[PDB]
Design a protein around this ligand. Structure first.
Ligand SMILES: [Zn+2]
Ligand SMILES: [Zn+2]
Ligand SMILES: [Zn+2]
Length: 105
């Protein structure tokens, strides 16, 4: 299995309101694109990635929130590791979020 490469997953705590599973919220809070949609895993921010204007990075630069998930591709990027994340917490929170996003699509 994956090594526990991202040390930021250990303290990940996902919101309980299932809010990101709502596709009506899949659009960038800064420029309103629906093309590239990265949901912050610390707060309810949603913002575009490098394909558009990388407002997701701008969010990290303004808040330090380190983890975001692309709601269609299911990639998780860690802005402190500067890499994509394949390891999960013991509760399997990232897998469940990914599986749930597959399901609501
Ligand atoms: Zn990390
Ligand atoms: Zn944007
Ligand atoms: Zn955030």
């Amino acid at each position: 299995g994956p090594m526990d490469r991202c040390k930021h997953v250990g303290r990940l705590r996902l919101a309980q309101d299932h809010s990101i599973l709502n596709p009506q919220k899949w659009c960038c809070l800064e420029c309103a694109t629906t093309e590239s949609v990265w949901a912050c895993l610390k707060c309810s921010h949603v913002a575009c990635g490098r394909y558009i204007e990388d407002h997701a990075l701008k969010h990290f630069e303004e808040t330090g929130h380190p983890l975001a998930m692309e709601v269609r591709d299911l990639y998780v990027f860690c802005y402190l590791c500067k890499d994509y994340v394949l390891n999960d917490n013991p509760e399997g929170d990232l897998k469940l979020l990914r599986s749930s996003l597959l399901a609501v699509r």
